[PDB]
């Protein structure tokens, strides 16, 4: 009974992560921050077609997936930092072609690989580097001319929700894999829950809402 019930969850990891992969590959959605979000899409789709099914070379991929997620979660907090502390535009200095090479390197290193090497370290820095970001993003957020927006006639409040949607996607992966790295099968089941949150929070938070609704023929809010 409960087994067949968990079969619907699988489709969520083969559909919720597909509508994302094909989304990035619209012109407006093609960005570096979204180029690592699609990296986590593959790490989630592979764990949904290779790990979830058989679990409900097989363990080799189970590691490659998870040890690449929390690894890229670190890549994000460091990339977005080089964009806020940046002088020019709210935009990382990582080029499109240099984003692909650091994406390919995330997999190889994640493959040659431990809860301190592939969990602690990448989460330790990922939390502090991002903590530095959310703090600076507040100092700058309201260093803005107060007159701006009420007497009209660059980092702003809109770009401040881009770190909210990224702050929760990074804040959920931790509470879903922390008790696990800290019944043992149930907490290893809580880990698989982060597979249905990515396409969920990417609705009522970012632009993806409009992306997802397009990929599905003018769903409802048209």
């Amino acid at each position, epitope marked *: 009974g409960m087994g067949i019930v968990m079969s619907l969850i699988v489709l969520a990891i083969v559909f919720g992560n597909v509508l994302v992969i094909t989304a990035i590959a619209f012109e407006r959605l093609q960005t570096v921050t979204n180029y690592f979000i699609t990296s986590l899409a593959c790490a989630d789709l592979v764990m949904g077609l290779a790990v979830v099914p058989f679990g409900a070379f097989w363990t080799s991929i189970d590691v490659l997936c998870v040890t690449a997620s929390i690894e890229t979660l670190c890549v994000i907090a460091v990339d977005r930092y080089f964009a806020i502390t940046s002088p020019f535009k709210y935009q990382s200095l990582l080029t499109k072609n240099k984003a692909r090479v650091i994406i390919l390197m995330v997999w190889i290193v994640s493959g040659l690989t431990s809860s301190i090497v592939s969990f602690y370290v990448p989460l330790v820095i990922m939390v502090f580097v991002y903590s530095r970001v959310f703090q600076e993003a507040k100092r700058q957020l309201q260093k803005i001319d*107060k*007159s701006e*927006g*009420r*007497f*009209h*006639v660059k980092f702003c*409040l*809109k770009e*401040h*929700k881009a770190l909210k949607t990224l702050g929760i996607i990074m804040g959920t992966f931790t509470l879903c894999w922390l008790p696990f790295f800290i019944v043992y099968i149930l907490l290893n089941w809580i880990g698989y829950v982060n597979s249905g949150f990515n396409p969920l929070i990417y609705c009522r938070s970012p632009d993806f809402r409009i992306a997802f609704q397009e990929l599905l023929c003018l769903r409802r809010s048209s």
Partner: antibody
Amino acid sequence: EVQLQQSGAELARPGASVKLSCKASGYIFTDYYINWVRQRTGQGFEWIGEIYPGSGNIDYNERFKDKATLTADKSSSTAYMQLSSLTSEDSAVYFCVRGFGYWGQGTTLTVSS
Amino acid sequence: DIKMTQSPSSMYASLGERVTITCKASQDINSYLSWFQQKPGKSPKTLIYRANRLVDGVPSRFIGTGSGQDYSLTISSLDYADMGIYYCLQYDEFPYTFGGGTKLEIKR
């Protein structure tokens, strides 16, 4: 042709609730905060809250904290104010400003049996 | 919160003469002050924001000049149409606090 339209008159019994709307049209809705200000009969103004349509950041006045709840509609380009458990002292003119720059028409709410 | 007095309270001036109204806040707003005008039976029209920056469409005879804690709206050469209640407003920090509002009439 910049303007924020409002009801002008709203009647509601005590203990009830009203939802005042403000239909802006003459600029880009998601470029300006919209503020809701209360001005009682022949008295000054008191800021209720300030919702920013673009993002969603809503900042209330402690006084109206659990009283009013602002809400915007990026599509309809209209913003509402949810006012709950109304009381006799809630009767006044409720303004919808485009951030203290362009004041709305004004809705004359009156709580009465 | 942040009290903001606004002297005078009442004021009778005659056409042509310059009326001046002052507005002081308790805290130190960063010139984030605004001046607006309520006329009996109308909606408040804004004259000035950011301490000195006239709003577009407002007569150049309105002059806001203040800094830090004390500001003041001046109108050189008072016009007949310039009769009503003028309020000041600070938007430096929450909650936004309005002034009492000085009322200006014209001696006939």
